Amino acid sequence: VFLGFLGAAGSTMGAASMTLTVQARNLLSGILTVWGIKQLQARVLAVERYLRDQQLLGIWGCSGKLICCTNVPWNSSWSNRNLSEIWDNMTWLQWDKEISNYTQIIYGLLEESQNQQEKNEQDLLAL
Amino acid sequence: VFLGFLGAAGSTMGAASMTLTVQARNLLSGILTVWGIKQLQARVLAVERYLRDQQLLGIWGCSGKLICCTNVPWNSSWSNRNLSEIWDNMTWLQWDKEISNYTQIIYGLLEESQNQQEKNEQDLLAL
Amino acid sequence: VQLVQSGAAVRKPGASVTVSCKFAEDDDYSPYWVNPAPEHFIHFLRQAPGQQLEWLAWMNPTNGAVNYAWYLNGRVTATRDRSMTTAFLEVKSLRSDDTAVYYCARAQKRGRSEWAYAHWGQGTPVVVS
Amino acid sequence: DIQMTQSPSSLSASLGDRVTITCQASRGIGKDLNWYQQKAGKAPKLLVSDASTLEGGVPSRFSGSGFHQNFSLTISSLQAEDVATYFCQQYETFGQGTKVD
Amino acid sequence: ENLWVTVYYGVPVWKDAETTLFCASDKHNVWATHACVPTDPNPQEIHLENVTEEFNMWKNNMVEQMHTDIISLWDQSLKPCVKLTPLCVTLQCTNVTRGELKNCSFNMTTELRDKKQKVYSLFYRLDVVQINKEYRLINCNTSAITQACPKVSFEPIPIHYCAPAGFAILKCKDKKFNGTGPCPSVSTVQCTHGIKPVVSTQLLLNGSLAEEEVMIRSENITNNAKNILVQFNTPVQINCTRPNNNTRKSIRIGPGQAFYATGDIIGDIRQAHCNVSKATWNETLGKVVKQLRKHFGNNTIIRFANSSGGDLEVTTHSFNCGGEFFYCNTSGLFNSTWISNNDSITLPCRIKQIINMWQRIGQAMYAPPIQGVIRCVSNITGLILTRDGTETFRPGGGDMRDNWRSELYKYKVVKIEPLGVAPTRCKRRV
Amino acid sequence: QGQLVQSGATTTKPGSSVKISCKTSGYRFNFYHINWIRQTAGRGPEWMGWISPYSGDKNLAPAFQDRVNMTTDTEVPVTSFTSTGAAYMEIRNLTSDDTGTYFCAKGLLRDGSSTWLPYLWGQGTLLT
Ligand SMILES: *[C@@H]1O[C@H](CO)[C@@H](O[C@@H]2O[C@H](CO)[C@@H](O[C@@H]3O[C@H](CO[C@H]4O[C@H](CO)[C@@H](O)[C@H](O[C@H]5O[C@H](CO)[C@@H](O)[C@H](O)[C@@H]5O)[C@@H]4O)[C@@H](O)[C@H](O[C@H]4O[C@H](CO)[C@@H](O)[C@H](O)[C@@H]4O)[C@@H]3O)[C@H](O)[C@H]2NC(C)=O)[C@H](O)[C@H]1NC(C)=O
Ligand SMILES: *[C@@H]1O[C@H](CO)[C@@H](O[C@@H]2O[C@H](CO)[C@@H](O[C@@H]3O[C@H](CO[C@H]4O[C@H](CO)[C@@H](O)[C@H](O)[C@@H]4O)[C@@H](O)[C@H](O[C@H]4O[C@H](CO)[C@@H](O)[C@H](O)[C@@H]4O)[C@@H]3O)[C@H](O)[C@H]2NC(C)=O)[C@H](O)[C@H]1NC(C)=O
Ligand SMILES: *[C@@H]1O[C@H](CO)[C@@H](O[C@@H]2O[C@H](CO)[C@@H](O[C@@H]3O[C@H](CO[C@H]4O[C@H](CO)[C@@H](O)[C@H](O)[C@@H]4O)[C@@H](O)[C@H](O)[C@@H]3O)[C@H](O)[C@H]2NC(C)=O)[C@H](O)[C@H]1NC(C)=O
Ligand SMILES: *[C@@H]1O[C@H](CO)[C@@H](O[C@@H]2O[C@H](CO)[C@@H](O)[C@H](O)[C@H]2NC(C)=O)[C@H](O)[C@H]1NC(C)=O
Ligand SMILES: *[C@@H]1O[C@H](CO)[C@@H](O[C@@H]2O[C@H](CO)[C@@H](O)[C@H](O)[C@H]2NC(C)=O)[C@H](O)[C@H]1NC(C)=O
Ligand SMILES: *[C@@H]1O[C@H](CO)[C@@H](O[C@@H]2O[C@H](CO)[C@@H](O)[C@H](O)[C@H]2NC(C)=O)[C@H](O)[C@H]1NC(C)=O
Ligand SMILES: *[C@@H]1O[C@H](CO)[C@@H](O[C@@H]2O[C@H](CO)[C@@H](O)[C@H](O)[C@H]2NC(C)=O)[C@H](O)[C@H]1NC(C)=O
Ligand SMILES: *[C@@H]1O[C@H](CO)[C@@H](O[C@@H]2O[C@H](CO)[C@@H](O)[C@H](O)[C@H]2NC(C)=O)[C@H](O)[C@H]1NC(C)=O
Ligand SMILES: *[C@@H]1O[C@H](CO)[C@@H](O)[C@H](O)[C@H]1NC(C)=O
Ligand SMILES: *[C@@H]1O[C@H](CO)[C@@H](O)[C@H](O)[C@H]1NC(C)=O
Ligand SMILES: *[C@@H]1O[C@H](CO)[C@@H](O)[C@H](O)[C@H]1NC(C)=O
Ligand SMILES: *[C@@H]1O[C@H](CO)[C@@H](O)[C@H](O)[C@H]1NC(C)=O
Ligand SMILES: *[C@@H]1O[C@H](CO)[C@@H](O)[C@H](O)[C@H]1NC(C)=O
Ligand SMILES: *[C@@H]1O[C@H](CO)[C@@H](O)[C@H](O)[C@H]1NC(C)=O
Ligand SMILES: *[C@@H]1O[C@H](CO)[C@@H](O)[C@H](O)[C@H]1NC(C)=O
Ligand SMILES: *[C@@H]1O[C@H](CO)[C@@H](O)[C@H](O)[C@H]1NC(C)=O
Ligand SMILES: *[C@@H]1O[C@H](CO)[C@@H](O)[C@H](O)[C@H]1NC(C)=O
Structure with a gap:
């Protein structure tokens, strides 16, 4: 099936996670007059917001990945939910709300876990 | 030899394929007055067209690659030409014309072949 | 749209005649916000009774440039008024064979076929005798 | 300098017949030919421009084709209102005309 | 066989497109060349071996884009300048001690709004119309008028x-x-050569020559309604001068508003004109008449005539010399009939000041008078002919984009599309 | 993927020279060599030589080096990837041993190990 842009918004986190490229395509293209400056401001805004998400993927060792596995172990303080009660029960919309507070913390952990990982790889290849 | 920007435009697809970084460098740098707004419109246009090619490479698992090998098998309906009659006979200009129609189809195949590849890698590392 | 021409005329051999042709309907309106494309030439043609259609000259209403037919021998002049809404065709040294119905034709502004006369006038019968 | 040979000079057909008129050029003119229809006591009306482009408002029964030197104007299923004189146009030179009856 | 598609990034392939170009250059001139990016001192020109591209100078969008860029820069360079609408008043004009330039006195506004002044200024004939005789500036009943700022230069800059x-x-x-x-x-x-935006008529000035032989270009040369763009290979030199020693006189017409009027002529009153070498113009017309036979016949006779009508801008060699807009009679250059098989020509040029530049009806410009004696030297490197619908060719023009087309034929804008998919016996791992 | 038409059957006598044409179309002429090959009565087929319209280079067998005049014009471009060329061939000391059918052949590929291989042939010309 082909649900469309945000088609799986109401589907479960597991279902939507197979339709990632759907939302990844339309993030950069889409699904001195008044309109002239109004459009230019939007064309620059789209690029800035895109490169910010790409910037975070880059410093997490996830550049080029849609599904990216990391080294940060899941702190149960963030959410003490079982695996089967998340990917087959919740929607990404609900999940983003429940992890609203802890999102900024995870973003830092994913960063130093990458600068230490490549610092280690620089030593693994020092022989 | 150093042919220059588009130097191998008339050379064979194999010859030009060794001079990829030549064309890759000058894709982003180059080889309220009237000119002021005329130049700003061009500086934004160059970035948008660049990130679109990078966006496609990213969702094909080719981000960072110049020569990228995939999993989509070559449908002979697209072109029933032999390997030696392409890379040592044709020029990329001719090739882009002969594959004009089927180009949009290949671009979709290269996308899901990557979202299924990483979905599989997420399972290979689930143990 | 049809072009408006002047009424019929009768002239002696050796006299002159002026055939007007209102090709536009403006007065003091033309500047826009975007740069407009060039205008199409106003062509003048005649057809003698029972003869073929004969091209005489075209006249650029923007700057007044003209291209008169060879066989006219400089006996024809084509101008336009200040408002550039009315063309004029003057034929000097009239002779008997100049008796014909005189038309003005213009291509369509949307099209780029300068000779595809989409617009025509009702004709002006000129008789020299 | 160019010479347009239109043939035939006159023809007659019944209501519903297929009528074709040809214009031959003494040398290559690309697709720069226009077809007109002129009735008695009226100004011509543009039928086909650029050899093969039907003008807007002209009934679909008309059609034109040609390139280089051989051109043609066709009326599929003749009608009563089609009685007029048809002539091709190459720049300032016209064909000698065809009187349909 | 075992063939999988592979992605290639950076393949020499392109498409015909049209994008927004930007300028580059090397007092402020009207073409704001100071606002352009500096021309790189190392101009990279890469030769495309084996490549064969289709061109069409008559569809080129660079021409249509350049033409509106100049128009756009012209309008930009007149906003800050003074408006001469108070000059649209009744003039009392007398001849000057034939009858071309006049001597006109009017009541003018001073820097105080309740005081007048009876000032006088000289005006060329072509700038006034009648009603001491009572006259009036030509533009008053059609368009407002704006004095060109006397610090911007009309000099074509590359x-x-x-x-x-x-x-x-x-x-x-x-x-x-x-x-x-x-x-x-x-x-x-990456950029075009140094193109000088010379606004001219009939005779293409200071442009780029043709190597080898003299070329001739046209869409349909069999179409009489298409200007022939003939490009010389050897330049024929033309010398123009207004010899009158004019003087400029400032007239305060308001707070911060000064109209520069023509004061008086210091010395002899003479005609403005242009010289071309009659020998060099004879041999250049021959080179043109030669390539004219390749399209019309080795036996047909080629005849040159002057214009057949139109406005002053198209019936005359219209151009600009040291800041003043000349309008030269060319009947002395196109008066020859050619069969199957010291010298100087002099052209009577008039001078105008109220000029509408392009074809805009609504935006007139007053060119302020240039002090001193004007003379300029320039090459006529091209021509704009028009055959009569014996094949006779007469000069003409008007559409300024043919000037730009005469220098933009060599170029074409293409869009690089570096993604290429092609099959090889390659596949990635698991 | 085009035609390589040749001249007619010009039958002379020993001592003289004969010039055979080869006018190309439907393909970029300067991108492939032009091979010359003959099949005479008395032997089988014999490869004479090829010439590179792009580089102007010529390579021919020692059995015909001092006999063959091999020259090419310059292509008149038709489209981006099409042109029209012409290849010429002459023979010096002509005899009756050299009587046979002569052809021109377009090279096979633009690179690799079979660049000049006679792939696309003409129709043949009958000599003395
Ligand atoms: C533009 O387009 C033209 C025409 O398509 C291209 O010209 C072709 O280039 C290819 C590759 O560059 C050529 O194929 C090669 O051919 C050589 C054979 O040449 C040898 O023999 C010749 C005769 O004895 C001799 O002249 C050569 O000597 C050199 O000097 C001459 C002087 O005239 C010079 O012109 C030559 O180029 C030579 O450099 C030489 O001794 C052959 O050896 C090659 O095969 C080797 O390499 C390939 C890999 O490339 C390998 O697979 C083989 O196994 C072998 O190792 C190769 O086949 C072709 O002959 C040219 N001409 C044609 C097709 O008509 C040109 O390259 C294009 N340029 C650009 C920039 O696009
Ligand atoms: C365009 O038209 C304008 C007119 O609108 C001309 O301007 C006038 O030009 C004339 C000359 O052509 C000027 O007349 C001269 O005025 C001089 C100034 O003297 C005045 O002031 C003194 C006080 O110092 C008084 O005594 C005197 O009466 C004047 O009122 C005089 O010096 C000149 O005298 C000369 O002529 C007389 C008689 O001909 C001789 O006897 C003298 O010896 C002497 O040679 C002369 O009278 C006039 O002033 C100008 N008007 C203005 C407002 O400036 C432009 O010249 C004209 N330009 C062109 C190019 O055609
Ligand atoms: C075609 O091109 C010609 C040359 O490229 C143009 O000639 C130029 O015309 C302008 C104005 O008409 C001249 O500029 C003037 O210069 C004089 C003084 O110049 C002299 O002094 C300077 C000292 O700085 C010296 O360097 C020069 O060489 C001269 O000796 C000023 O008094 C003026 O105010 C004005 O600035 C150019 O000098 C002149 N160039 C040449 C080489 O003659 C010609 O105008 C062009 N034609 C058209 C129709 O555009
Ligand atoms: C006017 O010019 C056009 C384009 O330059 C000519 O069109 C070409 O004509 C030749 C010969 O008839 C054809 O082989 C081409 O295919 C045509 N190309 C296009 C794009 O139409 C046209 O023939 C010219 N007309 C005249 C009267 O000279
Ligand atoms: C400037 O001189 C010319 C030339 O003498 C004058 O032109 C004359 O104008 C009158 C009208 O008032 C005509 O009747 C004459 O036929 C014209 N003569 C010529 C030779 O054309 C002109 O009037 C003078 N202007 C002023 C302001 O004195
Ligand atoms: C007018 O004449 C020639 C153009 O042919 C120019 O003079 C030559 O300019 C070239 C390059 O600028 C030099 O290599 C030659 O040495 C010059 N010749 C001479 C005799 O000086 C001249 O600059 C042109 N003027 C323009 C285009 O304004
Ligand atoms: C043009 O006229 C001006 C004055 O109207 C002349 O300028 C004078 O030049 C001399 C030097 O030759 C100076 O001593 C004067 O002071 C200048 N006068 C002014 C008012 O500035 C100029 O020489 C004349 N030029 C020509 C070619 O006639
Ligand atoms: C145009 O003007 C130029 C320069 O003002 C003239 O060139 C001069 O010609 C004479 C005679 O041959 C030479 O003595 C000078 O040396 C030349 N000047 C330069 C700067 O080289 C040219 O003759 C004039 N041509 C016309 C047609 O008027
Ligand atoms: C969970 O997070 C808290 C603070 O938010 C931290 O103190 C604790 O060590 C974390 N536990 C694990 C297992 O990471
Ligand atoms: C985040 O902090 C706010 C503080 O007002 C709290 O109300 C909210 O419950 C917190 N989020 C979660 C998921 O506990
Ligand atoms: C080739 O493409 C067609 C449709 O374009 C498809 O039906 C067919 O299955 C494809 N074949 C292969 C081998 O991929
Ligand atoms: C692509 O489709 C068009 C349809 O008009 C067709 O003419 C063209 O041949 C197709 N491309 C190829 C490579 O077959
Ligand atoms: C200026 O105004 C006065 C007021 O009566 C008038 O007499 C005079 O003629 C005017 N001057 C001009 C040049 O119009
Ligand atoms: C402007 O005045 C001139 C006088 O020369 C007249 O011929 C013309 O018709 C007028 N034009 C307009 C638009 O009023
Ligand atoms: C330019 O040259 C080509 C080939 O020589 C020719 O087909 C074309 O008609 C020429 N252009 C004109 C305007 O004659
Ligand atoms: C052209 O020449 C004729 C006769 O030589 C002349 O009457 C006419 O005024 C001239 N036209 C121009 C614009 O010089
Ligand atoms: C141009 O000059 C000729 C004679 O040299 C003259 O007959 C003609 O009238 C002039 N042009 C104009 C527009 O006056």
Whole structure:
């Protein structure tokens, strides 16, 4: 099936996670007059917001990945939910709300876990 | 030899394929007055067209690659030409014309072949 | 749209005649916000009774440039008024064979076929005798 | 300098017949030919421009084709209102005309 | 066989597109060349071996883009300048001690709004119309009028059009390349050569010559309604001068508003004119008449006549010399009939001041008078003929984009599309 | 993927020279060599030589080096990837041993190990 842009918004986190490229395509293209400056401001805004998400993927060792596995172990303080009660029960919309507070913390952990990982790889290849 | 920007435009697809970084460098740098707004419109246009090619490479698992090998098998309906009659006979200009129609189809195949590849890698590392 | 021409005329051999042709309907309106494309030439043609259609000259209403037919021998002049809404065709040294119905034709502004006369006038019968 | 040979000079057909008129050029003119229809006591009306482009408002029964030197104007299923004189146009030179009856 | 598609990023392939170009250059001139990016001292020209591209100078969008850029820069360079609408008042004019230039006195507003002043100024005939005799500036009943700022220069400065990143320009190295067709030798450049935006009529001035032979270009040369763009290979020199020693006189017409009027002539009253070498113009007309036979016949006779009508701008060699807009009679250059098989020509040029520049009806410009004696030297490197619908060719023009087309034929804008998919016996791992 | 038409059957006598044409179309002439090959009565087929329209280079067998005049014009471009060329061939000391059918052949590929291989042939010309 082909649900469309945000088609799986109401589907479960597991279902939507197979339709990632759907939302990844339309993030950069889409699904001195008044309109002239109004459009230019939007064309620059789209690029800035895109490169910010790409910037975070880059410093997490996830550049080029849609599904990216990391080294940060899941702190149960963030959410003490079982695996089967998340990917087959919740929607990404609900999940983003429940992890609203802890999102900024995870973003830092994913960063130093990458600068230490490549610092280690620089030593693994020092022989 | 150093042919220059588009130097191998008339050379064979194999010859030009060794001079990829030549064309890759000058894709982003180059080889309220009237000119002021005329130049700003061009500086934004160059970035948008660049990130679109990078966006496609990213969702094909080719981000960072110049020569990228995939999993989509070559449908002979697209072109029933032999390997030696392409890379040592044709020029990329001719090739882009002969594959004009089927180009949009290949671009979709290269996308899901990557979202299924990483979905599989997420399972290979689930143990 | 049809072009408006002047009424019929009768002239002696050796006299002159002026055939007007209102090709536009403006007065003091033309500047826009975007740069407009060039205008199409106003062509003048005649057809003698029972003869073929004969091209005489075209006249650029923007700057007044003209291209008169060879066989006219400089006996024809084509101008336009200040408002550039009315063309004029003057034929000097009239002779008997100049008796014909005189038309003005213009291509369509949307099209780029300068000779595809989409617009025509009702004709002006000129008789020299 | 160019010479347009239109043939035939006159023809007659019944209501519903297929009528074709040809214009031959003494040398290559690309697709720069226009077809007109002129009735008695009226100004011509543009039928086909650029050899093969039907003008807007002209009934679909008309059609034109040609390139280089051989051109043609066709009326599929003749009608009563089609009685007029048809002539091709190459720049300032016209064909000698065809009187349909 | 075992063939999988593989992605290639950076493949020499392009498409015909049209993008927004930007300028590059090397007092402020009207063409704001100071606002352009500096022309790079190392101009990279890459030659495309084996490549053969189709060109069509008559569809080129660079021309249509340049033409509105100049118009756009012209309008930009007149906003801050003074408006001469208070000059649209009744003039009392007398001849000057034939009858071309006048001597006109009017009541004018001072810097105080309740005081007048009876000032006088000289005006060329072409700038006034009747009603001491009572006159009036020509523009008053059609358009407002704006005095050109006397610090901007009308000097053509070499401008280079550059394409953005990811686009390119394709030159045409073919020494005998006419208008359209497939250019055998092609190269790619980032910007065009130094194009001088010379606004001219009939005679293409100071432009770029043709190598080898003299070329002739046209869409349909069999179409009489298409201007012939003939390009010389050897320049014929033309010398123009207004010899009157004019003087400029400031007239305060308001707070901060000064109208520069023509004061008086210091010395002899003479005619403005242009000289061309009659010998060099004879041999150049011959080179033209030669290539004219290749399209019309070795036996037919080629005749040159003067214009047949129109406005002053198109019936005369219209141009600009040291800041003043000349309008030269050319009947002395196109008066020859050619069969199958010290010298100087002098042209009577008039001078105007109320000029509408392009074809805009609503935006007139007063060119302030230039002090001193004006003389300029320039090459006529091209021509704009028009055959009569014996094949006779007469000069003409008007549409300023033919001027730009005479220098932009060599170039074409293409869009680089570097993604290429092609099969090989390659596959990635698991 | 085009035609390589040749001249007619011009039958002379020993001592003289014969010039055979080969006018190309439907393909970029300067991108492939032009091979010359003959099949005479008395032997089988014999490869004479090829010439590179692009580089102007010529390579021919020692059995015909001092006999063959091999020259090419310059292509007149038709489209981006099409042109029209012409290849010429002459023979010096002509005899009756050299009587046979002669052809021109377009090279096979633009690179690799079979660049000049006679792939696309003409129709043949009958000599003395
Ligand atoms: C533009 O387009 C033209 C025409 O398509 C291209 O010209 C072709 O280039 C290819 C590759 O560059 C050529 O194929 C090669 O051919 C050589 C054979 O040459 C040898 O023999 C010749 C005769 O004895 C001799 O002249 C050569 O000597 C050198 O000097 C001459 C002087 O005239 C010079 O012109 C030559 O180029 C030579 O450099 C030489 O001794 C052959 O050896 C090659 O095969 C080797 O390499 C390949 C890999 O490339 C390998 O697979 C083989 O196994 C072998 O190792 C190769 O086949 C072709 O002959 C040219 N001409 C044609 C097709 O008509 C040109 O390259 C294009 N340029 C651009 C920039 O696009
Ligand atoms: C365009 O038209 C304008 C007119 O609108 C001309 O301007 C006038 O030009 C004339 C000359 O052509 C000027 O007349 C001269 O005025 C001089 C100034 O003297 C005045 O002031 C003194 C006080 O110092 C008084 O005594 C005197 O009466 C004047 O009122 C005089 O010096 C000149 O005298 C000369 O002529 C007389 C008689 O001909 C001789 O006897 C003298 O010896 C002497 O040679 C002369 O009278 C006039 O002033 C100008 N008007 C203005 C407002 O400036 C422009 O010249 C004209 N330009 C062109 C190019 O055609
Ligand atoms: C075609 O091109 C010609 C040359 O490229 C143009 O000639 C130029 O015309 C302008 C104005 O008409 C001249 O500028 C003037 O210069 C004089 C003084 O110049 C002299 O002094 C300077 C000292 O700085 C010296 O360097 C020069 O060489 C001269 O000796 C000023 O008094 C004026 O105010 C004005 O600035 C150019 O000098 C002149 N160039 C040449 C080489 O003659 C010609 O105008 C062009 N034609 C058209 C129709 O555009
Ligand atoms: C006017 O010019 C056009 C384009 O330059 C000519 O059109 C070409 O004509 C030739 C010969 O008839 C054809 O082989 C081409 O295919 C045509 N190309 C296009 C794009 O139409 C046209 O023939 C010219 N007309 C005249 C009267 O000279
Ligand atoms: C400037 O001189 C010319 C030339 O003498 C004058 O032109 C004359 O104008 C009158 C009208 O008032 C005509 O009747 C004459 O036929 C004209 N003569 C010529 C030779 O054309 C002109 O009037 C003078 N202007 C002023 C302001 O004195
Ligand atoms: C007018 O004449 C020639 C153009 O042919 C120019 O003079 C030559 O300019 C070239 C390059 O600028 C030099 O290599 C030659 O040495 C010059 N010749 C001489 C005799 O000086 C001249 O600059 C042109 N003027 C323009 C275009 O304004
Ligand atoms: C043109 O006229 C001006 C004055 O109207 C002349 O300028 C004078 O030049 C001399 C030097 O030759 C100076 O001593 C004067 O002071 C200048 N006068 C002014 C008012 O500035 C100029 O020489 C004349 N030029 C020509 C070619 O006639
Ligand atoms: C145009 O003007 C130029 C320069 O003002 C003239 O060139 C001069 O010609 C004479 C005679 O041959 C030479 O002695 C000078 O040396 C030349 N000047 C320069 C700067 O080289 C030219 O003759 C004039 N031509 C016309 C047609 O008026
Ligand atoms: C969970 O997070 C808290 C603070 O938010 C931290 O103190 C604790 O060590 C974390 N536990 C694990 C297992 O990471
Ligand atoms: C985040 O902090 C706010 C503080 O007002 C709290 O109300 C909210 O419950 C917190 N989020 C979660 C998921 O506990
Ligand atoms: C080739 O493409 C067609 C449709 O374009 C498809 O039906 C067919 O299955 C494809 N074949 C292979 C081998 O991929
Ligand atoms: C692509 O489709 C068009 C349809 O008009 C067709 O003419 C063309 O041949 C197709 N491309 C290829 C490579 O077959
Ligand atoms: C200026 O105004 C006065 C007021 O009566 C008038 O007499 C005079 O003629 C005017 N001057 C001009 C040049 O119009
Ligand atoms: C402006 O005045 C001139 C006088 O020369 C007249 O011929 C013309 O018709 C007028 N034009 C307009 C638009 O009023
Ligand atoms: C330019 O040259 C080509 C080939 O020589 C020719 O087909 C074309 O008609 C020429 N252009 C003109 C305007 O004659
Ligand atoms: C052209 O020449 C004729 C006769 O030589 C002349 O009457 C006419 O005024 C001239 N036209 C121009 C614009 O010089
Ligand atoms: C141009 O000059 C000729 C004679 O040299 C003259 O007959 C003609 O009238 C002039 N042009 C104009 C527009 O006056």
